């Protein structure tokens, strides 16, 4: 016997996941989810997600663990290039687009999206950064689009030899192979810190 209050004020995971427009990888958006009951069962029981990897916590032990903050990051990346979304990984995305901490605790979501983000002529709304002076720190974003000083001749804001443009756009197209089709990605982060606990899993009675 156990009798807990009514279930109300559920977290808006539906609008985060079932959206239409996702930002590019170099300009991912972050949304703070807090002060609501978060039922992660509806996320797991869905068969739409091809990739569901959880680091530091079993997925079915989330409906009892009460955190304080949940962050959601959404972006679109290539097919054979989603393997870089994992702690301690190397590649263009990890180096210059989105860096995950080595001790990251959370879950990564990825499902194919060839039905919406592929134009027969070519979808060019999605860009990924190629160059930067140094590696991204864990959980920061770069928005500046200055000319990358490839060599030692100063660019002075004018594109030239060894003066390249850092942002290049994916040429998404339905004809592309499985390894080149777009893959929507959502990353959930869980924090514990000295504050009252707000988010919880549903408590069945």
């Amino acid at each position: 016997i156990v009798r807990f209050p009514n279930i109300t004020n559920l977290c808006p995971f539906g609008e985060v996941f079932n959206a239409t427009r996702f930002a590019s990888v170099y300009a991912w958006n972050r949304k703070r989810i807090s002060n609501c009951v978060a039922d992660y069962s509806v996320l797991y029981n869905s068969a739409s997600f091809s990739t569901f990897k959880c680091y530091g916590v079993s997925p079915t032990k989330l409906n009892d663990l009460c955190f304080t903050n949940v962050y959601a990051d959404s972006f679109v990346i290539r097919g054979d290039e989603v393997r870089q979304i994992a702690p301690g990984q190397t590649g263009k995305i990890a180096d210059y687009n989105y860096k995950l901490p080595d001790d990251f605790t959370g879950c990564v979501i990825a499902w194919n999206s060839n039905n919406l983000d592929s134009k027969v002529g070519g979808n060019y709304n999605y860009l990924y950064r190629l160059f930067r002076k140094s590696n991204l720190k864990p959980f920061e974003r770069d928005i500046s689009t200055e000319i990358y000083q490839a060599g030692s001749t100063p660019c002075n804001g004018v594109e030239g030899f060894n003066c390249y443009f850092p942002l290049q756009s994916y040429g998404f197209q339905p004809t592309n192979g499985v390894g080149y089709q777009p893959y929507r990605v959502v990353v959930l982060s869980f924090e514990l810190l000295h504050a009252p606990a707000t988010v919880c899993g549903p408590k069945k009675s």
Epitope: T20, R21, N114, N115, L116, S118, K119, V120, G121, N123, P174
Partner: antibody
Framework: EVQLVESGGGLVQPGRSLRLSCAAS????????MHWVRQAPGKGLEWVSG????????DYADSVKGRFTISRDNAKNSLYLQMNSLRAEDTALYYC????????????????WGQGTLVTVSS | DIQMTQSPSSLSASVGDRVTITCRAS??????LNWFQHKPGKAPKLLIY???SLQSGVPSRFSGSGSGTDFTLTISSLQPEDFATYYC??????????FGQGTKLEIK
């Protein structure tokens, strides 16, 4: 439960112009794409035109290029289709479909439709 | 280019049978086909998006299958409100959104 009501149909002489409108109220209109689908009086369906969520990419059917101009109004939750230089083979039935995605030429198909409006081209 | 065909044109069945309709394409489309239920008196409705994915809110009696070039729609129970004309559409080639011809379905 989404509503798509059309108007502007009737009868015009060949070579004249007429306009169509299609009002949407059951969903968020500012970030979906829409199309126009023609059904012949005694034949199958046929695509005509399409517009993006914002008026950037517009495509037309091969048989109606250079004659039809589709428009869109995000503020009033309505889209229009200006028909120009009508001939005798455009006496069909016109629907107002809704795209599942946000672009024009995607694998995603038409999700929600509306009742057709009847047009006639004869003297 | 691309061409789209409908093998059956008129079919007959009863309330307690099963009906399969096949749609054939001229070139490979890679599981990008859609099936529409067009009632003669109202606005046509979509049943299956993608090769074999069933849209929300429609009965599970309709079942689609097939990939590559040849596709097929299957109906299991044949409830007596299931009279309509069904079209198959491709959304993968350069000629945009090509519709196949009608497939009349009457019960007797």
């Amino acid at each position: 439960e989404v509503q798509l009501v059309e108007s502007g149909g009737g009868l015009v002489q060949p070579g004249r112009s007429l306009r169509l409108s299609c009002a949407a109220s059951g969903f968020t209109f500012d970030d979906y794409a829409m199309h126009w689908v023609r059904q012949a009086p005694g034949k199958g369906l046929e695509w005509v035109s399409g517009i993006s969520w914002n008026s950037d990419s517009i495509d037309y059917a091969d048989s109606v290029k250079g004659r039809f101009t589709i428009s869109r109004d995000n503020a009033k939750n309505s889209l229009y289709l200006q028909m120009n230089s009508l001939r005798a083979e455009d006496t069909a039935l016109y629907y107002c479909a809704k795209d599942r995605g946000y672009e024009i030429l995607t694998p995603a198909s038409f999700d929600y439709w509306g009742q057709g409006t009847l047009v006639t081209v004869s003297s | 280019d691309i061409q789209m065909t409908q093998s059956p044109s008129s079919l007959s069945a009863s309330v307690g049978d099963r009906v399969t309709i096949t749609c054939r394409a001229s070139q490979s489309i890679s599981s990008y086909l859609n099936w529409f239920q067009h009632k003669p008196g109202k606005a046509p409705k979509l049943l299956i998006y993608g090769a074999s994915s069933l849209q929300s809110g429609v009965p599970s009696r309709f079942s689609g299958s097939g990939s590559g070039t040849d596709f097929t729609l299957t109906i299991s129970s044949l409830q007596p409100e299931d009279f309509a004309t069904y079209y198959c559409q491709q959304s993968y080639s350069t000629p945009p959104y090509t519709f196949g011809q009608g497939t009349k379905l009457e019960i007797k």
